[PDB]
Amino acid sequence: YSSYIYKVLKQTHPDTGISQKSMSILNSFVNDIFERIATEASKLAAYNKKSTISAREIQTAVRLILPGELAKHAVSEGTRAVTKYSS
């Protein structure tokens, strides 16, 4: 998970400074989110009694975890990503 974060870095910000510990702790935060999101997703799946995790599970999970405007931004970009990948 290195080239991807460096490339998003160089596209969003043209001028920036970088040290290894910076995206070291960044990797940590994203890994925490992935684990958290794995927890909520799995629990709601068990709660709704579905052995298959699919879209509705992660829509529900993201909605319940992340609040505010970033939540609807996240679901918006996820939706455009899945439609641009389903076809």
């Binding site: 400074g17 910076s22 702790i25 960044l26 994203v30 298959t52 609040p67 970033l70 970009e77």
Partner: protein, 81 residues
Amino acid sequence: SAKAGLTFPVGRVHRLLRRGNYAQRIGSGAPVYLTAVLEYLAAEILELAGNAARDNKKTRIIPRHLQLAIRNDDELNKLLG
């Protein structure tokens, strides 16, 4: 990731979620959705760190600017604890 220029790959996240065995089967849209949401939240933090760096008046980035950015954002504080 190379289908339409997506950044994060599908194999690494797929094997990471499979190692937890949270479900018997994985949906088709789950990997792409999680790659999308994860990269988005990561940028939400990188851009915040960047503006904190610009706030520091230094193009460089160190975790102190990240701490200032995360503390400034109340919703990000609630999300990240």
